[PDB]
Structure formats: C-alpha cells, structure tokens
Structure 1
Amino acid sequence: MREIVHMQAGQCGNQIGAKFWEVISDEHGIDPTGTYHGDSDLQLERINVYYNEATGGKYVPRAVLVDLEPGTMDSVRSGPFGQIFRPDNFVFGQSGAGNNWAKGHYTEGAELVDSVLDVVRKEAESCDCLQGFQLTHSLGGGTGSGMGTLLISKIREEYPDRIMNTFSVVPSPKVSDTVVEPYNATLSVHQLVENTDETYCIDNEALYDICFRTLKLTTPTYGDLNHLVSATMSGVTTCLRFPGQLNADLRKLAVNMVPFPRLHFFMPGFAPLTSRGSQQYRALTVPELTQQMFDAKNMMAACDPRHGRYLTVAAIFRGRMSMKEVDEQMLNVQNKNSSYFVEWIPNNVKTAVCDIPPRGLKMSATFIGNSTAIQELFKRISEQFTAMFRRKAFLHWYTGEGMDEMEFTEAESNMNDLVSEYQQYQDATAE
C-alpha cells in the first residue's frame, strides 16, 4: 500500500489543498461527512492512499494544514469538505507571517515547526508503506515560502529516502501580487533545489490564459483556477490508486524525468480541456488529446516552451483507449518536432495509461514537461533580486531578526548557478 502525506502551507496552500481534497473525495465517492457515498467497489481497494479508516465508515484525509493566522483555517473549516479533516491536524500560529521569509522561517513560525513535525510524524507513522510527501505551498510569498521550505528541509533530514513533491506557485511575468516576491522566490527556491525531488511550477498568469483563451469562462471566478490544478493533482497521482495497463508511480516519474539531480522543476498540464461551447463540435480521441498535450496554450507555466529544449515529457492517460495509438502519437510528435526535443536523449516521452477515467469525462491526459524553458523564470527573478539587492531594498526588515547578508549572497550564487546548468544542458551538442 503506497502512501502519500498531504501538506498545505499558507493561504494558497490551504486553498489549493481544499480544492484537491474536494476533487479527490468526489472521485472516491466520499461525502463531506465521511461516509462512502459511491457506486463501485474498485475505489475502496486503494482508498488507504489518501484516507485513513476511522470508527464506523469515516475516512479521514491525511492533511497537515499549516498557517500562522487562523483566518484561512476558519475559512477552510467553514467551507465545504472542511469538516472531513481531523481537527487535531489544524496547526496554526498567533503572531503572524505570510509575506516575510524571515518571519516564516527563523522566528514566529519557528515555534510551530515542532508541532507541525509532530503531526507529520503521527500521520506518516500510521502508514503501512510510506512513499512520499506532497506539499501544496507557493513560493515567493510568506509561509508558503518560509514555513514550506523549513518543513521540506526537516522532512528531508528525517526521511532521506521517501519521495517529495511540491506544487509551488511561481511569480507571474507581469504584475507582482506581492512586493517582496522577488526576494522570497529566490529564498524559497534555494531550499527547494537540494531538498525536494519534484517541483511542479504552476503559474497564475498561465492559469488565467488557459482559463480565458481555451476554457472561455467570461467570469473566471476562483474555483475553476484551483480546480485545474486539482485536476493536475489527481491526474499525476492516478496510478497509485487505480489499476491500469501501464503503471508509473512517483518514483518511476522521478527516475524518468530528472536526468541530473538539480533539474527537477516540471511544467504541469491537463488536456481534455474542452470549452463551454465547442464540446459537441469537438471529437475527443487520442489525436485531439495529444494535440492539446503538445500545445503552448496548455502548459500552465509562464515560460514559453518554444524557447529552450524539451528534456522530457510524461503523458499520464486516464480512461479506456488503445496503446498502439497512444504510442504512435508520442512517436509522431517527436518526429514532427525535431529541434524542440533534445537530440542527445532519444525519445523524450514517458507514457503511462491507466483505467478508470475521471468523473464526467471519457478520456484524460496530464502533461508534465521538463523543458529547459523554465530557466526564464530563474533568470527573471535573479534579475529582480540583483536589482533590489544592489540598493538593499526591503533588507533592514529582513535583518531585524538576524539575517546577515551571507544568506543572500550564497542564495543568489545558487540562484544563478541553476541558470548556468540549465543554459549548459540546453543546447549542448550530442557528439
């Protein structure tokens, strides 16, 4: 029984975790109270992956929600699928953090680290065979950066072998949505480099673009934006809880994507992706799914995939389909796109087809790209970090509780170092 522990950090973390738990409970047929309100018995065979059995028929999720303010805790508790969580797992502070990496990593939240680690140990030691930890934080903010990175560091120090993935939300190319976001983005990704094993960089701006151009959605509201990321969640974790023809777990995805250990920043994707109107006028097959898979208006990261090169692409398919077609189309996209993929690594596609398609859909696809286009985000945040560190913008309200400048120096050093390996392995000649 493969086991994953789910953790939420900050306002963004709690919101995306709530949407993920709502979607996965709808998939598994679990009502907000806890009783299995479903039809088939196939969804109970692997229900222990994301649920823990209680007295009676209740299935409590293994979620370790963290915040430094009780406001988002009250919001997620009052909202739907909020009473399903264990009330002993809501760990919240009182002082306050949420935009400052020092406030979320060295003080204030540093007191809550012991309690969160205690809850993490209690939930991860109730597992039969632990596999990994999914943190749904957001870099560039506060506790999504500070608390998230400190928890990742502590869990990686305690459990050096289990797989570890984050679903961090990167800063948008335009706007800022936070002034000290260039500071906290580097200060979080520095710890994300040598601790995590997978990081699925999701972008708000590309989420807006895919909600507007493809999904139409005249009002974008807010539920659909996190619903897409929750669809990416359930798509990428399908093989651990559903049977299929080709099964690829988190460790198989780990050994398939990342070639060299500090190259594990992946671009998510989801591609039945039908519009409000053009859904009867559209035929969903493997050709149409693959056309949406390998399309720049579908990869929900900010970086343009035309720049750089594709190191590798995963293709998690859900539904009942044919292996010959889902194989020959991943052949022919590589045949059509010569220079887009790397030539020194032949056939950069890992397919995995599983049965039991999601609710209200025939077939489904989950794009995961490890292209070298992601160096643009690293370059741009390095540019803002240099631009503000040359004049010490916002620096004294970091140094007020410690924070000597050496942390910034060999944070920026690794920050540009990762840009250096991305540039070096982007367009290297094979032989």
Structure 2
Amino acid sequence: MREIVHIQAGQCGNQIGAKFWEVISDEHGIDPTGSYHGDSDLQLERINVYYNEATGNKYVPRAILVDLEPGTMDSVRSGPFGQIFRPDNFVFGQSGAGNNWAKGHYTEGAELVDSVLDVVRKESESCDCLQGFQLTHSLGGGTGSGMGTLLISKIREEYPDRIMNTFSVMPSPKVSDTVVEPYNATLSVHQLVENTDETYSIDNEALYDICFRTLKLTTPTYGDLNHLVSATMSGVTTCLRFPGQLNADLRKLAVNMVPFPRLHFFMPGFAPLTSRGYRALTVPELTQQMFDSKNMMAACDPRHGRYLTVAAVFRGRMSMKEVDEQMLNVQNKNSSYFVEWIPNNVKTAVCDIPPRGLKMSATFIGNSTAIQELFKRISEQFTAMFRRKAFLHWYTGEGMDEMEFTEAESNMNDLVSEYQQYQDATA
C-alpha cells in the first residue's frame, strides 16, 4: 500500500477523469506543466499516491487514458492540463464502441485491451508499493461500460491481491436518450458486483436534479454535472492524498465500508453544493447538508433505508470539538437510520486544506441499503425491453447470447434482494 494507478475509459470516463486531475493538481499545487508551486508541505507528504516524480523534480499523474475513438482524448490533450499526462499513457482506437457494451467488452475493446495493460504494467513497475486501481467511466456507453469492466477483470487476473475501486456513472433518461443504456448498465453492474472492492455510484439523475432544483440551472450542461463529480472525487479521495488516521488507504477504507463483499456500492454526498460561478458554512450546516437527500450523488432517499457504514470527511479550518459534536448529534438524533448490529459505523476525518474557492466543505460516503432504489430503476428499464427482447440484435450481432442478459438481470435482482435483507435485519 502507497501508489494508486488511475485509468479513465470512454467519453464520460475521460471527461470526469480529466476534471479530477485538474482539481487535485491545483490542490497539491502542481501547474499544467507538472512543476510544484505551493505554499504548504502538506501538499507533497502524500503526493506519490497519485503522482510519479520525474527527473528535474516534475510531477507526472499516474494516469492511463483509454478510448475506442480519438475524440475526447484529443480535446483532453488540447485541454489546460493535457500536458501534465504522460503521452505514452494515451491508449486509443479509431473504430468507436457505438454505445454497445458487446463492442467494448468482446469485439472492438478486445483489439485494444492488451496495449492498455502494457501501460498498466509499466506504471505498476515504477511503484514501491502499489495499493490498487482507480477507474472513471460511465455504465451507459460502450467503451467505459464494456471495455472498462473487461479492463477491471483483466487487471484483477494480473493483480489479484490489489484493491479495485471505481467511480461509475449511472444512466438517466433526463441526461441521455440512448435506448440501450439500461442493457449496458445492467451488464456493467454484474461485472462491478464480482470484480470491484469499492464503487462510488455517481448518478446522472441526481447530478441533473441538483443542477436544476438546487443550483437553479435551467439548461445544465455536462460540465455542470462534472463540476459536482470533480468536487465529489476530490472529497472521497482526500484521506488517501493528505496525512491522516482514518481511511488513509484503499484497503483500510474497504474494511471500514464493506460488511458484505457484494454490498460495496457507495452513495456519495457533498456540502456546499455549488455551480461554477463569499458566505462560509458553519460546522452544523455542513453536517445537516452532507446527510440530506438533496446533497446525495445517487438518486436514492437515505430515509428509505438504513446505513450499514458511513465515512464523513470535513475539509478546512474548523472546530474538531464541534465537528465531533455535530457528527454525534446527527447519529443520536436519527439512530433508527443506522443498523444497530454494526456498532459505531460512522467514522469521521478532518483535513486542514479545503477545496478551491471554499473556506469549508464536507464529503459524505455512505453504504446505505437505499442504493437498491437506483438498481431497481435500471432493472425496471432493462426488464421492460428484455421481456420483448427489443434492441438485442445489436448485442447478438456481436456474438452475445440472451443467457448473459438473463444472468446479469438475475445478479442485479439478487443484489437488490441482499440490500433488502440487511434493511429488515435486527439485532
């Protein structure tokens, strides 16, 4: 445990993956060239978790950029920070995955996958002690969906002893109009259940509704949604990047958050919710907000379920007494929403460095049984098409069988049944 290898696949993966490096680069005082220009040495104490230090004391992100089309990666290379990334670490195709999981996993992705793994291997070599892997991707497309999950499976074969963690973007009919998305998403969940240690369920429905109802953006863009995603990614990784006691590594996080191996889908939360365009928040406000439904990055009502485990990260200069007071107040005021059979399931961290333009923030990470709502949604949409076998030719024309679909459908339905099991479980 020390170094994290980051992989970003497909359009969504590369867009959110790019925004991630831009945000934490500024946080750790690294300019678009890779040169350090910060005020604190707290910025470099754990820099090697995400960055490789190179000759002439220049910091290179330990990032692999994957896609089955050049498009997005070209705009990432043309972008502000595209210069920070190692150019040998840009692995792309020309075909595209055409929003088809079968193309990303079996046909087109199959052709590119070993070139990615050679870059994964090279990065893994330059590691004194590799922790595991981080992947950004959407579950609704073809590349990040199909290729991303095949890359996880292949990485797991070569590194079975390491931690596999993902930032998976869930589809919403409010953001996308690609009919096949529920199919790709169910095929991807089946993979995530088996092969990941931790998954941050980033839901496009919740990101859209936050932008519309709370940020009062009439016509939200992808960059608006990605702004909330980059804030969430910066917050959920804090403990890994800065000196600290709680969840300072991927494994310690998993042991605190995962009571049952399939139940590793986290509902991230964030306070204050902001749009890209003064008024500081009190420790009590940060606490009410981070636990509020309106601040969740997954379109689930936490009050409809029970928390199995919670991680709370507070960023900035505040009272550790008051943080502790408010955290205990939240648990003691709503004790029914926290399983009694997992004693002291809420663990809190406080980090002195806040994000850009915020005096203070709070990031929540919850393993709530209410995540079954997101899975019931994708399941409702999948079953509606699959019971009439609609749009399957796109998949069977790639060599897949109805069996894979029936299996994926079953595993996700079983996962929803498991989350219910522990919601109705008493001590």
Band of TM-score, shorter chain? over 0.9
Three-state SS of the structure 2 residue aligned to 1:350 is strand
Superimposed CA distance per residue, residues 1-56 of structure 1 (whole angstroms, 9 cap, x where no aligned partner): 71111110100000001100111111122111222233333323322221112232
**Distance verdict in 2 for CA 1:426–1:330, change over 3 Å:** same
1:132 and 1:163 in contact (8 A); partners too: yes
What is the rounded CA distance, in whole Å, between the counterparts of 1:274 and 1:233 in structure 2? Answer: 14
2:375 and 2:416 in contact (8 A); partners too: yes
What is the rounded CA distance, in whole Å, between the counterparts of 1:55 and 1:187 in structure 2? Answer: 43
RMSD: 2.1
Superimposed CA distance per residue, residues 53-85 of structure 1 (whole angstroms, 9 cap, x where no aligned partner): 223232211111110001112111111111211
- What is the CA-CA distance between 1:251 and the residue it aligns to? 1.9
**Distance verdict in 2 for CA 1:161–1:98, change over 3 Å:** farther
Q: Which moved more, 1:329-338 or 1:194-203?
A: 329-338
Three-state SS of the structure 2 residue aligned to 1:95 is coil
Q: Report sequence identity in percent.
A: 98
- What is the CA-CA distance between 1:379 and the residue it aligns to? 1.7
Q: Which moved more, 1:307-316 or 1:352-361?
A: 352-361
What is the rounded CA distance, in whole Å, between the counterparts of 2:394 and 2:208 in structure 1? Answer: 33
- What is the CA-CA distance between 1:215 and the residue it aligns to? 3.3
- What is the CA-CA distance between 1:283 and the residue it aligns to? 4.9
What is the rounded CA distance, in whole Å, between the counterparts of 1:392 and 1:342 in structure 2? Answer: 40
1:246 and 1:353 in contact (8 A); partners too: no
Which residue of structure 1 lines up, in the alignment, with residue 386 of structure 2?
A: 389
Which residue of structure 1 lines up, in the alignment, with residue 38 of structure 2?
A: 38
- What is the CA-CA distance between 1:221 and the residue it aligns to? 4.3
What is the rounded CA distance, in whole Å, between the counterparts of 2:177 and 2:199 in structure 1? Answer: 21
What is the rounded CA distance, in whole Å, between the counterparts of 1:229 and 1:243 in structure 2? Answer: 23
What is the rounded CA distance, in whole Å, between the counterparts of 2:410 and 2:370 in structure 1? Answer: 20
Which residue of structure 2 lines up, in the alignment, with residue 202 of structure 1?
A: 202
1:315 and 1:366 in contact (8 A); partners too: yes
- What is the CA-CA distance between 1:274 and the residue it aligns to? 5.6
Which of residues 381, 392, 407 is equivalent to 1:410?
407
1:303 and 1:373 in contact (8 A); partners too: yes
Superimposed CA distance per residue, residues 88-127 of structure 1 (whole angstroms, 9 cap, x where no aligned partner): 1111112221400111101111011100011011112211
What is the rounded CA distance, in whole Å, between the counterparts of 1:224 and 1:412 in structure 2? Answer: 32
What is the rounded CA distance, in whole Å, between the counterparts of 1:388 and 1:245 in structure 2? Answer: 48
Three-state SS of the structure 1 residue aligned to 2:141 is coil
**Distance verdict in 2 for CA 1:246–1:191, change over 3 Å:** closer
Identify unmatched segments of 5+ residues in structure 2: none
Q: Which moved more, 1:169-178 or 1:390-399?
A: 169-178
What is the rounded CA distance, in whole Å, between the counterparts of 1:77 and 1:209 in structure 2? Answer: 31
Superimposed CA distance per residue, residues 372-398 of structure 1 (whole angstroms, 9 cap, x where no aligned partner): 111112222222222222221111221
What is the rounded CA distance, in whole Å, between the counterparts of 2:239 and 2:142 in structure 1? Answer: 33
What is the rounded CA distance, in whole Å, between the counterparts of 1:338 and 1:90 in structure 2? Answer: 48
Three-state SS of the structure 2 residue aligned to 1:240 is helix
- What is the CA-CA distance between 1:248 and the residue it aligns to? 3.6
2:46 and 2:243 in contact (8 A); partners too: no
- What is the CA-CA distance between 1:289 and the residue it aligns to? 0.9
**Distance verdict in 2 for CA 1:213–1:222, change over 3 Å:** same
Which residue of structure 1 lines up, in the alignment, with residue 234 of structure 2?
A: 234
| TM-score normalized with structure 1 length | 0.93
**Distance verdict in 2 for CA 1:242–1:338, change over 3 Å:** closer
Q: Which moved more, 1:195-204 or 1:351-360?
A: 351-360
Three-state SS of the structure 2 residue aligned to 1:346 is coil
**Distance verdict in 2 for CA 1:220–1:385, change over 3 Å:** closer
1:246 and 1:354 in contact (8 A); partners too: no
| TM-score normalized with structure 2 length | 0.94
**Distance verdict in 2 for CA 1:428–1:95, change over 3 Å:** same
Three-state SS of the structure 2 residue aligned to 1:306 is helix
Three-state SS of the structure 2 residue aligned to 1:128 is coil
Which residue of structure 2 lines up, in the alignment, with residue 97 of structure 1?
A: 97
What is the rounded CA distance, in whole Å, between the counterparts of 1:182 and 1:239 in structure 2? Answer: 33
**Distance verdict in 2 for CA 1:4–1:411, change over 3 Å:** same
What is the rounded CA distance, in whole Å, between the counterparts of 1:14 and 1:187 in structure 2? Answer: 21
What is the rounded CA distance, in whole Å, between the counterparts of 1:75 and 1:276 in structure 2? Answer: 20
- What is the CA-CA distance between 1:275 and the residue it aligns to? 7.5
What is the rounded CA distance, in whole Å, between the counterparts of 2:38 and 2:114 in structure 1? Answer: 38
1:320 and 1:356 in contact (8 A); partners too: yes
Three-state SS of the structure 1 residue aligned to 2:165 is strand
Three-state SS of the structure 1 residue aligned to 2:63 is coil
Three-state SS of the structure 2 residue aligned to 1:238 is helix
- What is the CA-CA distance between 1:217 and the residue it aligns to? 4.7
**Distance verdict in 2 for CA 1:338–1:246, change over 3 Å:** closer
What is the rounded CA distance, in whole Å, between the counterparts of 2:40 and 2:333 in structure 1? Answer: 42
Q: Which moved more, 1:94-103 or 1:206-215?
A: 206-215
1:290 and 1:329 in contact (8 A); partners too: yes
- What is the CA-CA distance between 1:276 and the residue it aligns to? 9.0
Which residue of structure 1 lines up, in the alignment, with residue 368 of structure 2?
A: 371
- What is the CA-CA distance between 1:414 and the residue it aligns to? 0.9
Three-state SS of the structure 1 residue aligned to 2:266 is strand
Superimposed CA distance per residue, residues 289-313 of structure 1 (whole angstroms, 9 cap, x where no aligned partner): 1011111110111112221222222
1:245 and 1:353 in contact (8 A); partners too: no
What is the rounded CA distance, in whole Å, between the counterparts of 2:175 and 2:11 in structure 1? Answer: 19
User: Larger % of helix: which?
Assistant: 2
Superimposed CA distance per residue, residues 338-384 of structure 1 (whole angstroms, 9 cap, x where no aligned partner): 33222333333111222222233322211111111111122222222
Three-state SS of the structure 1 residue aligned to 2:335 is coil
- What is the CA-CA distance between 1:323 and the residue it aligns to? 2.9
- What is the CA-CA distance between 1:247 and the residue it aligns to? 5.7
2:131 and 2:249 in contact (8 A); partners too: no
Superimposed CA distance per residue, residues 208-231 of structure 1 (whole angstroms, 9 cap, x where no aligned partner): 222333334566444342122112
1:10 and 1:98 in contact (8 A); partners too: no
2:280 and 2:360 in contact (8 A); partners too: no
Which residue of structure 2 lines up, in the alignment, with residue 317 of structure 1?
A: 314
2:61 and 2:84 in contact (8 A); partners too: yes
